[PDB]
Design an enzyme around this catalytic site. Structure first.
Site, PDB file in Angstrom:
ATOM      1  CG  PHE A  39      -5.021 151.644  14.582  1.00  0.00           C
ATOM      2  CD1 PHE A  39      -5.040 150.230  15.030  1.00  0.00           C
ATOM      3  CD2 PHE A  39      -5.898 152.500  15.560  1.00  0.00           C
ATOM      4  CE1 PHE A  39      -5.876 149.491  15.883  1.00  0.00           C
ATOM      5  CE2 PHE A  39      -6.519 152.024  16.497  1.00  0.00           C
ATOM      6  CZ  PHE A  39      -6.600 150.486  16.508  1.00  0.00           C
ATOM      7  CB  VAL A  42      -6.931 146.015  19.131  1.00  0.00           C
ATOM      8  CG1 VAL A  42      -6.096 145.365  20.366  1.00  0.00           C
ATOM      9  CG2 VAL A  42      -6.181 147.316  18.971  1.00  0.00           C
ATOM     10  CE  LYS A  57      -2.366 150.229  16.632  1.00  0.00           C
ATOM     11  NZ  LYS A  57      -1.566 151.356  17.122  1.00  0.00           N
ATOM     12  CG  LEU A 110      -3.201 147.055  29.012  1.00  0.00           C
ATOM     13  CD1 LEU A 110      -2.842 148.468  28.232  1.00  0.00           C
ATOM     14  CD2 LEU A 110      -2.045 147.069  30.111  1.00  0.00           C
ATOM     15  CG  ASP A 156      -5.294 160.529  18.789  1.00  0.00           C
ATOM     16  OD1 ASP A 156      -5.899 161.443  18.688  1.00  0.00           O
ATOM     17  OD2 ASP A 156      -5.495 159.489  18.405  1.00  0.00           O
TER      18      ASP A 156
HETATM   19  O1  LIG Z   1      -2.603 150.587  20.334  1.00  0.00           O
HETATM   20  C1  LIG Z   1      -3.661 150.690  20.628  1.00  0.00           C
HETATM   21  N1  LIG Z   1      -4.629 151.479  19.873  1.00  0.00           N
HETATM   22  C2  LIG Z   1      -5.678 151.230  20.234  1.00  0.00           C
HETATM   23  N2  LIG Z   1      -7.068 151.653  20.067  1.00  0.00           N
HETATM   24  C3  LIG Z   1      -8.065 151.290  20.444  1.00  0.00           C
HETATM   25  C4  LIG Z   1      -8.327 149.990  20.888  1.00  0.00           C
HETATM   26  C5  LIG Z   1      -9.743 150.032  21.361  1.00  0.00           C
HETATM   27  C6  LIG Z   1     -10.755 150.717  21.366  1.00  0.00           C
HETATM   28  C7  LIG Z   1     -10.285 151.954  21.032  1.00  0.00           C
HETATM   29  C8  LIG Z   1      -8.890 152.283  20.463  1.00  0.00           C
HETATM   30  N3  LIG Z   1      -5.507 150.105  21.228  1.00  0.00           N
HETATM   31  C9  LIG Z   1      -4.353 149.769  21.472  1.00  0.00           C
HETATM   32  C10 LIG Z   1      -3.521 149.104  22.503  1.00  0.00           C
HETATM   33  C11 LIG Z   1      -4.086 148.347  22.993  1.00  0.00           C
HETATM   34  C12 LIG Z   1      -3.282 147.433  24.094  1.00  0.00           C
HETATM   35  C13 LIG Z   1      -3.571 146.463  24.797  1.00  0.00           C
HETATM   36  C14 LIG Z   1      -5.062 146.534  25.142  1.00  0.00           C
HETATM   37  C15 LIG Z   1      -5.959 147.006  24.221  1.00  0.00           C
HETATM   38  C16 LIG Z   1      -5.315 147.884  23.252  1.00  0.00           C
HETATM   39  O2  LIG Z   1      -7.062 146.556  24.722  1.00  0.00           O
HETATM   40  C17 LIG Z   1      -6.974 146.162  26.209  1.00  0.00           C
HETATM   41  O3  LIG Z   1      -5.611 145.582  26.063  1.00  0.00           O
END
Ligand SMILES: O=C1N=C(Nc2ccccc2)N=C1Cc1ccc2c(c1)OCO2
Length: 350
Positions: A39, A42, A57, A110, A156
């Site tokens: 995608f 982030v 993101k 988060l 997913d």
């Molecule tokens: O929609 C998403 N797709 C993500 N993919 C991802 C992001 C980091 C590591 C592995 C996969 N992360 C988010 C959202 C997300 C939402 C809040 C967060 C966050 C990530 O990192 C910690 O705070």
């Protein structure tokens, strides 16, 4: 080829070239990259205006990706707005906007994702008590997605997309609805990360909310074992590794499965085996002879015997657990355990 992409803002993979310190729109102060992904990226950013950390993101700058991201936003907005308290297992999309030709989704910040969690404990896996806690949360979550007005398939689920709200705590939320879709409105056939992919999808059959439950099965096991349950290198390998643990799938499914012949063959007598294999090659265990009962280490001190003599890892407990997973890994999506009943399972009885 050293073109300049998007007035120098993007790299050659359509990603926005993240710069730490940059302040956007006199509001968001970009701290650091937290993660990549198909995608996009982030980033951790501080929102001056709301005086809080947010995770933004940054979608790739390509129509294909933007179009998807829009569906995501739409779904995130149905889930956030929906009523009962179950809506706090889906991550809050605070707001979204275009910036420098990237669609950007601002999320609540988060903590760790369950993979990062696994890795921090050197892949020895988290405790069963804790695996249970995640188990129960995810189940309520899937029941939320089940409510008729949503009917959302995530498509997913996987440790990277389950995040902790707080690093020293147990409470969690689901993320990344990029692949997601509502029932009926299904528009992709190659979905789910391979390890967490369901058999119905592999077989090229049509699919419903059941496919997430499957993924959850494989997640929970991995979370405790420290290591993924069906670690296929490719579709064929993946299907065989499923067959190792669960056997050949049923007649009535393979009969109706378009891609059934990729993996299996039908003998004269209407029964199915695995496809015949090159003269002499042995690579898998015989169907069903990799009993989950031992991968989990039910009677031998848990996975790798690494729970030998621990509180909260009783054999009685492991049995309860095995049974749940096994109903999450039902080959037949019509009879695979549904959230309402999963929550009323003996593995959750206090
Ligand atoms: O929609 C998403 N797709 C993500 N993919 C991802 C992001 C980091 C590591 C592995 C996969 N992360 C988010 C959202 C997300 C939402 C809040 C967060 C966050 C990530 O990192 C910690 O705070």
């Amino acid at each position: 080829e050293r073109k300049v992409y998007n007035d120098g803002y993007d790299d050659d993979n359509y990603d926005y070239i993240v710069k730490n310190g940059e302040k956007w729109m006199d509001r968001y102060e970009i701290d650091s990259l937290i993660g990549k992904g198909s995608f996009g990226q982030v980033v951790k950013a501080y929102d001056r205006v709301e005086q809080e950390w947010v995770a933004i993101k940054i979608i790739k700058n390509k129509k294909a990706f933007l179009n998807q991201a829009q569906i995501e936003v739409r779904l995130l907005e149905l889930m956030n707005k929906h009523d009962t308290e179950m809506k706090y297992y889906i991550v809050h999309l605070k707001r979204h906007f275009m910036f420098r030709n990237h669609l950007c989704l601002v999320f609540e910040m988060l903590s760790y994702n369950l993979y990062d969690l696994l890795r921090n404990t050197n892949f020895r896996g988290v405790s069963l008590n804790l695996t249970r806690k995640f188990a129960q949360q995810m189940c309520t979550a899937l029941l939320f997605l089940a409510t008729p007005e949503l009917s959302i398939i995530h498509c997913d689920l996987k440790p990277e997309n389950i995040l902790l709200c707080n690093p020293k705590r147990s409470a969690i939320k689901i993320v990344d609805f990029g692949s997601s879709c509502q029932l009926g409105q299904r528009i992709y056939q190659y979905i789910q990360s391979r390890f967490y992919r369901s058999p119905e999808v592999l077989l090229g059959m049509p699919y419903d909310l059941a496919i997430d439950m499957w993924s959850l099965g494989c997640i929970l096991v991995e979370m405790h074992t420290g290591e993924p349950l069906f670690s296929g290198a490719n579709e064929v390998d993946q299907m065989n590794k499923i067959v190792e643990v669960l056997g050949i799938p049923p007649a009535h499914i393979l009969d109706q499965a378009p891609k059934a012949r990729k993996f299996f063959e039908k003998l004269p007598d209407g029964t199915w085996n695995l496809k015949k294999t090159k003269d002499g090659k042995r690579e898998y265990k015989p169907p069903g002879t990799r009993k989950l009962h031992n991968i989990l280490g039910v009677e031998t001190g848990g996975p790798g015997g690494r729970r030998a003599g621990e509180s909260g890892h009783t054999v009685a407990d492991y049995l309860k657990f095995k049974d749940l997973i096994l109903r999450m890994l039902d080959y037949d999506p019509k009879t695979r355990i549904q959230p309402y009943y999963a929550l009323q399972h003996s593995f959750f009885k206090k």
